Scaffold this active site. Structure first.
Site, PDB file in Angstrom:
ATOM      1  CE  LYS A  91     -11.041  -8.261 -12.640  1.00  0.00           C
ATOM      2  NZ  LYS A  91     -11.023  -6.685 -13.705  1.00  0.00           N
ATOM      3  CG  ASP A  92     -10.759  -8.930  -4.679  1.00  0.00           C
ATOM      4  OD1 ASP A  92     -10.208  -8.691  -5.933  1.00  0.00           O
ATOM      5  OD2 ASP A  92     -10.246  -8.557  -3.329  1.00  0.00           O
ATOM      6  CD  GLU A 116       0.610 -33.861   2.657  1.00  0.00           C
ATOM      7  OE1 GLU A 116      -0.245 -33.802   1.505  1.00  0.00           O
ATOM      8  OE2 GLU A 116      -1.014 -34.562   3.099  1.00  0.00           O
ATOM      9  CB  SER A 174      -1.046  -1.777  -6.254  1.00  0.00           C
ATOM     10  OG  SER A 174      -1.202  -3.526  -7.398  1.00  0.00           O
ATOM     11  CG  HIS A 195      -2.175  -0.458   0.968  1.00  0.00           C
ATOM     12  ND1 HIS A 195      -3.292  -0.492   2.023  1.00  0.00           N
ATOM     13  CD2 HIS A 195      -2.615  -1.693  -0.423  1.00  0.00           C
ATOM     14  CE1 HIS A 195      -4.476  -1.517   1.321  1.00  0.00           C
ATOM     15  NE2 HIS A 195      -3.663  -1.861   0.156  1.00  0.00           N
TER      16      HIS A 195
END
Ligand SMILES: CCCCCCCCCCCCCCCCCC(=O)OC[C@H](COP(=O)([O-])OCC(O)COP(=O)([O-])OC[C@@H](COC(=O)CCCCCCCCCCCCCCCCC)OC(=O)CCCCCCCCCCCCCCCCC)OC(=O)CCCCCCCCCCCCCCCCC
Ligand SMILES: CCCCCCCCCCCCCCCCCC(=O)OC[C@H](COP(=O)([O-])OCC(O)COP(=O)([O-])OC[C@@H](COC(=O)CCCCCCCCCCCCCCCCC)OC(=O)CCCCCCCCCCCCCCCCC)OC(=O)CCCCCCCCCCCCCCCCC
Ligand SMILES: CCCCCCCCCCCCCCCCCC(=O)OC[C@H](COP(=O)(O)OCCN)OC(=O)CCCCCCCCCCCCCCCCC
Ligand SMILES: CCCCCCCCCCCCCCCCCC(=O)OC[C@H](COP(=O)(O)OCCN)OC(=O)CCCCCCCCCCCCCCCCC
Ligand SMILES: CCCCCCCCCCCCCCCCCC(=O)OC[C@H](COP(=O)(O)OCCN)OC(=O)CCCCCCCCCCCCCCCCC
Ligand SMILES: CCCCCCCCCCCCCCCCCC(=O)OC[C@H](COP(=O)(O)OCCN)OC(=O)CCCCCCCCCCCCCCCCC
Ligand SMILES: CCCCCCCCCCCCCCCCCC(=O)OC[C@H](COP(=O)(O)OCCN)OC(=O)CCCCCCCCCCCCCCCCC
Ligand code: HEM
Ligand code: HEM
Ligand code: HEM
Ligand code: HEM
Lengths: 52, 116, 77, 388, 60, 31, 388, 115
Positions: free
Chosen positions: G233-234, G277, G211, G207
């Site tokens: 959108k998220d 894993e 971005s 921030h």
């Protein structure tokens, strides 16, 4: 006078500064809108470095 | 009721103690009103003359310095102190009366407290 | 006569070498005297001795608490 | 001042927020040693968190292994006795310094405007502290832990509509058993981090409006930076607290405790004296003093209602009690009553302790019911003592 | 005064030397305090320690 | 630069002394 | 504008920081869905924390009770199989989402200036995720759990002078027994909160410097507020992820695991196929490929050194891969190499997989060693292609 | 160095860059982020306002197209100058000034702030 002046090298400057500047007491005289000027302890601490 | 030191021994003692404390720190009773407290005191101080407000700030700074140093005013100026010689209550009353009128008939608050 | 110049103005306009401090809970040294700069540093040095020892104690106590235990030490034969 | 090139690594964005809010935040130059307790509760919280993590590396939340695991930490683990005594006596210290914090706030009327949010977040922190300490005290699974958990959680069935349903859900069964122990352990691990978050919000609000001072006056005329002037003051406070804590760890490690907790919990036998830790005693005393246990739970809720309602009272322009003789005497009476009420909690529920606790609760609530009256009456002081 | 100034000019001109001095002093003071407290312990409770019971090795 | 090298060497000495004081490997140090 | 009377609650000091950083933060107008992947990783972390707390309300960290306690969660607890499958498959989806996050960063060169701190904090976050998932996988105490713990902790012996001491200290008692189980439970509970702190610092640094965008260009011309444009959108991303994760939970919950973890740990026999894993498999493959286990540990350290050394490259002027055909091809080759490397780690050490792994890891480091060359040549480009 | 007019691979690379840059309606110099280097910042400050404003307009157009998921119409794609640079000379001059200033005992005129 010129011989005395150019007989001053970096080591001499360091030695004289260490004699006069390193961890000595300052005297501050200020006036005006100095409400943001740092106080005495600030300068007195800035007279030395902790990195060296 | 209205209990004043002339008609009440207990009120007389209370006033005497308050006078003693304020004289010790050398600041008037009106100086205790915090502008951040009410925001009506802020307006009343905004309306007062600069000489009066500067005297208030000087007295408050002197009191805070004495508080830090853990000492009291010397007895000379302590005898020269004049607490309860008000300079703010009339203006504060005027401001509150104006606010009450504005609220009573229509009106939006001229100033408001942030949250928080 | 008429002016009665303020205290701060009179102080600014009249510098004097007879400066007076508060001296209530901190008494002055006499004007001609060296500053005891080293003594304070050695006092602080003793305090730093103690602080370093305490930090060392705490780190070792926690880390060796996370270490093995008398139970497993005795179990291993 | 155009920041074309770097001057000070403190003012660079990486250290700018810390610079501001820790090194350069201005504070009144007349603060006493009573603000170090606010600075010191955070240290107590950090100590609790670290010792608790290193203890949880050795504790087993089962019902057949909790007590033996605690004794394993006592005996086998190298330095384990230090960890356990630190955790227990550190909970005690945390509560001591938080009580000093609260009572300084009460004395200097720090709850007054504009720090209502500071006080309210403090009350929420107090709730979190109480719940954390209780659910943690249930962990060693001694007689006192088991039966205190039974009594206090069972006294949640006073709610009219739900009651037994909430109690059964909270217990995970029909009685305080292994499910409740495991649940309490998980919650005890989680809650301190919410407590750290709440402390950070507490500090953020205070820094929004700035700290009070003994005189209670506006103090933006004479202010100094936090570091180094208050750093050294808080350092003196921390070292004194360390000496106190070291006394309470190495010489009297169980004085603040209750001996019946060193007995493995036995649901078929009840100890003759079921009482909580010394720092739940005033609350317990109020709860017991009010009869009709539903009324007791209502009173306990009302205590927090009063605490949250303190900052939203009447005018009371003067705030510091150094200039309020009547409020000063009232505060001292309140502190004496709280100490007496804490004493009452440990006593049995026989006479005359019932009456002594019933009067003490009434005085405690009268404190909150009298301060608005003091403010209302004192609102008209200058007009009466004026020298015109 | 003179002694303090002399040790100052010895060990307080570089912060690295000062840190080394602080650590060495902490170690030496810790060991000295250990020794003193142990001597006080021995003086106070004499005749109680493990290697003092008259029959320490006769349970066979 | 020589002064920087001396300062770095002294700081390395100080850090080594601190690590040695923290770990206390007096038993380990055979050579 | 003098804020005399308050207009909007969002601009009030209680919601001002939240307002700025969540609602009003200007965002490039052309972001695709991979920024949604970053938000999705945050949501996966929250899901893991919540389900882990509610799981730890039922898990016993003892060696004699852990496996049967997990089977308790699956069979007896009301809707406990949902909690356990959510936790396990949520670890898997957390790693999937973080991998897509990382590879978008690599493709669009988001690690370049001025987001070096963002990338470095991301690397620290990835380390924390690796450690947390490993210690958590030790908790169920099966064959794979115990033996993977044994191997991965015993490869810490590769340190030259203090390897054995560190191994024994971390083991707590010459093996991976109950002491290690309790230790790992406490650490697994603690680490996610440090992970939350690291995520918050990650977001704060980003921030600070805005971005990136699919073009890699300066993007302060066309910027829009985060809400509601990128919240929706998220949200689309979150719902699609929920469908994916629900496919995994309910219909194929054990596909992403190994069947050897359903056998109680037996330190006597050894399962024929010991692998971590699936999301540790690339690292395991690199380490296994380079022999001389000291060299393997050094190689893992070198992997993280390269990851930390990406941001601090010299010229690297053009950022996005849309205008870098050579780097676009290099990135796709690297992704294919990473997938192949992950597949190699599940295979035995028998040939030809040794050769394939020793080539794949070399190609991985080759990618990390040929980006500066491309940057320098690209810096040389503009004075050659001029059309005049 | 045998890039231009003598390397088939370099010719293909130039063709691809021209295609992409003209497709978004950008120039190569517009790919230089001021926040990336802090020398591009000084160069852009020194450049004429008309050139800087045209650069900003092209950047805004490109970001708009990238949002809309479409390219320039074939007409504006034809009327494109992807490699008519405007920044290389000023950037080189700024770098040379920096070079001499560091060469003989000088403070940097600007430094990157630690994030
Ligand atoms: C996060 C972790 C890192 C934090 C770093 C912070 C400081 C950053 C910095 O650069 O500072 C220098 C900075 C020096 O001042 P300056 O104005 O930047 O420059 C002065 C000189 O010109 C230049 O100063 P200098 O040359 O004297 O040295 C400054 C600094 C510069 O550092 C360097 O140059 C590189 C690093 C050292 C290299 C050599 C080793 O070097 C050192 O500090 C030497 C350290 C040597 C090793 C000691 C072991 O320090 C300060 O100003 C003081 C900061 C004090 C911070 C106090 C924090 C706590 C106070 C509030 C407590 C509240 C309660 C807490 C508890 C609550 C409950 C939990
Ligand atoms: C990025 C997202 C990656 C998703 C990988 C999913 C995964 O682990 O699936 C393997 C997982 C293993 O189960 P399994 O192979 O049936 O049983 C293991 C047996 O040992 C039987 O095993 P197997 O011998 O038949 O084959 C084992 C093979 C599984 O075989 C297949 O997948 C066959 C094709 C389907 O295992 C793998 O391929 C595991 C490695 C693949 C993931 C590597 C991710 C690397 C990301 C980049 C790393 C960068 C590191 C540095 C970062 C900075 O599931 C499957 O193979 C079947 C489901 C696949 C679903 C794919 C689409 C949804 C995702
Ligand atoms: C009922 C109480 C009525 C009080 C009426 C006003 C009393 C004001 C006063 O001066 O009280 C005496 C004293 C405080 O005054 P002072 O003697 O100045 O204290 C500091 C120096 N000794 O002491 C007090 O003010 C104590 C007041 C206690 C009130 C308790 C109420 C229950
Ligand atoms: C508004 C604030 C927020 C709201 C919540 C309330 C906050 C309250 C803040 C203050 C808290 C104070 C807590 C006091 C705890 C008192 C513990 C206690 O009762 O200790 C008693 C004990 C006496 O010895 P013991 O043998 O145990 O007693 C016989 C028991 N069968 O030990 C002692 O007596 C030691 C001394 C105890 C403390 C002083 C008591 C003085 C008064 C008692 C005599 C009258
Ligand atoms: C128990 C309560 C006894 C007092 C009841 C009357 C009352 O509330 O008076 C309020 C006022 C409080 O004064 P106080 O705030 O302590 O100090 C002055 C700075 N505002 O107290 C007074 O003004 C008291 C004056 C009369 C004396 C007591 C009757
Ligand atoms: C392992 C981890 C364990 C946990 C660690 C602590 C977790 C704390 C969680 C809450 C952190 C919230 C963010 C705090 C830092 C912050 O807000 O920094 C703001 C700053 C933005 O940059 P700038 O606009 O220059 O701000 C300074 C002058 N306005 O930010 C920056 O420039 C970058 C700051 C990076 C972090 C510095 C510390
Ligand atoms: C056996 C041992 C040795 C093994 C390796 C031996 C071979 C080495 C590589 C040989 C080939 C190198 C080719 C380099 C020149 C590429 C020319 C170029 O950029 O062409 C333009 C083309 C644009 O693509 P497009 O836009 O689709 O085209 C339409 C045009 N209107 O652009 C493209 O099509 C993009 C092509 C990108 C290719 C990138 C990868 C190859 C080049 C670097 C190899 C590095 C190998 C090591 C690292 C691998 C990755 C970790
Ligand atoms: C995340 C941090 C914490 C962890 C991991 C933790 C963990 C533990 C564990 C495992 C125990 C049982 C061991 C024992 O009984 O000595 C315990 C007990 C206890 N904890 Fe905590 N704790 C934490 C924070 C706190 C805090 C902040 C408080 C205070 C508010 C607290 C108060 C207590 C108390 C009073 C006990 C009972 C001690 C006893 O009587 O034996 N804990 N804690
Ligand atoms: C976790 C426990 C707590 C911590 C860590 C904490 C921390 C702090 C800190 C750091 C300050 C600033 C320094 C100071 O003024 O002393 C402060 C101030 C304050 N706190 Fe707390 N606090 C805690 C609990 C409480 C509680 C329970 C209350 C009351 C409900 C409270 C009310 C206040 C008030 C009113 C102030 C303002 C002090 C002033 O007048 O300037 N705090 N606290
Ligand atoms: C706990 C896992 C992580 C979380 C929650 C997380 C969260 C975020 C968030 C919220 C953003 C801003 C929104 C966005 O751009 O997508 C972001 C951006 C970013 N993250 Fe992460 N992140 C994580 C892991 C990582 C890792 C492992 C890396 C790489 C080492 C990384 C590198 C980046 C980069 C480079 C950006 C810049 C985005 C851009 O350029 O547009 N993150 N992350
Ligand atoms: C503080 C939050 C967390 C807690 C309290 C927690 C607690 C637990 C517990 C008790 C288990 C064992 C239960 C079981 O066997 O299913 C477990 C398993 C596990 N956890 Fe967590 N966890 C947390 C966060 C995470 C995170 C962030 C990850 C990383 C993705 C993670 C990864 C795992 C894995 C891989 C397992 C083993 C899955 C399995 O049972 O097969 N946990 N966790």
């Amino acid at each position: 006078l010129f011989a005395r002046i150019d007989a001053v090298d970096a080591s001499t400057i360091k030695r004289v500064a260490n004699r006069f500047i390193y961890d000595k007491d300052v005297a501050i005289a200020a006036m005006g809108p100095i409400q943001r000027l740092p106080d005495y302890n600030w300068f007195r601490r800035r007279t030395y470095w902790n990195r060296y | 009721s209205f209990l004043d030191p002339k008609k009440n021994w207990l009120a007389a003692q209370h006033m005497k103690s308050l006078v003693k404390r304020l004289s010790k720190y050398g600041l008037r009773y009106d100086d205790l009103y915090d502008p951040y407290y009410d925001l009506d005191v802020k307006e009343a101080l905004n309306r007062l003359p600069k000489e009066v407000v500067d005297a208030r700030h000087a007295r408050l700074k002197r009191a805070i310095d004495l508080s830090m140093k853990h000492e009291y005013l010397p007895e000379d100026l302590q005898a020269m102190q004049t607490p309860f010689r008000g300079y703010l209550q009339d203006m504060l009353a005027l401001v509150k009366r104006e606010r009450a009128e504005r609220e009573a008939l229509g009106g939006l608050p001229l100033y408001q407290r942030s949250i928080p | 006569l008429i002016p009665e110049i303020p205290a701060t103005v009179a102080a600014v306009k009249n510098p004097s070498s007879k400066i007076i401090y508060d001296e209530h809970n901190h008494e002055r040294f006499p004007p001609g005297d060296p500053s005891k700069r080293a003594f304070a540093y050695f006092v602080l040095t003793g305090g730093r001795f103690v602080y370093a020892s305490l930090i060392r104690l705490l780190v070792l106590k926690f880390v060796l608490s996370m270490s093995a235990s008398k139970d497993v030490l005795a179990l291993a034969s | 001042t155009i920041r074309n090139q770097r001057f000070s690594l403190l003012k660079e964005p990486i250290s700018s927020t810390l610079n501001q809010h820790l090194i350069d935040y201005p504070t009144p130059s007349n603060l006493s040693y009573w603000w170090g307790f606010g600075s010191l509760a955070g240290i107590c919280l950090v100590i609790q968190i670290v010792t608790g993590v290193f203890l949880a590396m050795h504790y087993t939340p089962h019902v057949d292994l909790a007590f033996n695991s605690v004794e394993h930490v006592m005996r086998d683990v190298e330095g384990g006795w230090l960890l356990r005594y630190m955790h227990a006596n550190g909970a005690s210290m945390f509560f001591i310094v938080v009580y000093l914090h609260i009572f300084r706030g009460l004395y200097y009327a720090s709850y007054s405007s504009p720090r209502e949010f500071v006080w309210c977040l403090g009350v929420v922190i107090f709730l979190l502290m109480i719940v954390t300490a209780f659910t943690g005290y249930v962990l060693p699974w001694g007689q006192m832990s088991f039966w205190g958990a039974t009594v206090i959680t069972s006294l949640a069935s006073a709610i009219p509509v739900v009651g037994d349903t909430i109690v059964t859900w909270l217990w995970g069964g029909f009685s305080v058993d292994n499910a409740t122990l495991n649940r309490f352990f998980s919650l005890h691990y989680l809650l301190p981090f919410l407590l750290v978050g709440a402390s950070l919000l507490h500090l953020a609000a205070l820094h929004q409006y700035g700290s009070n001072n003994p005189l209670g006056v506006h103090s933006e005329m004479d202010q100094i930076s936090f570091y180094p002037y208050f750093y050294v003051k808080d350092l003196v406070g921390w070292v004194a607290f360390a000496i106190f804590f070291s006394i309470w760890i190495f010489y009297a490690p169980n004085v603040l405790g209750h001996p019946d907790n060193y007995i493995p919990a036995n649901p078929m036998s009840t100890p003759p004296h079921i009482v909580p830790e010394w720092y739940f005693l005033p609350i317990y005393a109020i709860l017991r003093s009010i009869p009709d246990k539903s009324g007791g739970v209502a009173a306990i809720a009302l205590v927090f209602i009063c605490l949250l309602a303190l900052p939203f009272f009447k005018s009371m322009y003067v705030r510091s009690s150094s200039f309020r003789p009547i409020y000063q005497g009232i505060f001292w009476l309140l502190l004496a009553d709280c100490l007496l009420l804490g004493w009452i909690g440990c006593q049995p529920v026989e006479a005359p302790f019932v009456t002594i606790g019933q009067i003490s609760s009434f005085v405690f609530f009268l404190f909150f019911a009298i301060t608005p009256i003091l403010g209302r009456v004192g609102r008209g002081i200058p007009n009466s003592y004026t020298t015109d | 005064g003179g002694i303090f100034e002399s040790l100052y000019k010895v060990v307080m001109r570089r912060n690295s030397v000062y840190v080394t001095f602080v650590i060495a002093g902490a170690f030496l003071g810790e060991r000295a305090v250990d020794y003193g407290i142990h001597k006080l312990w021995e003086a106070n409770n004499v005749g109680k320690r493990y290697e003092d019971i008259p029959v320490l090795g006769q349970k066979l | 630069q020589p002064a920087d090298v001396k300062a770095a060497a002294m700081w390395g000495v100080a850090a080594a002394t601190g690590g040695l004081y923290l770990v206390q490997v007096s038993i380990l140090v055979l050579p």
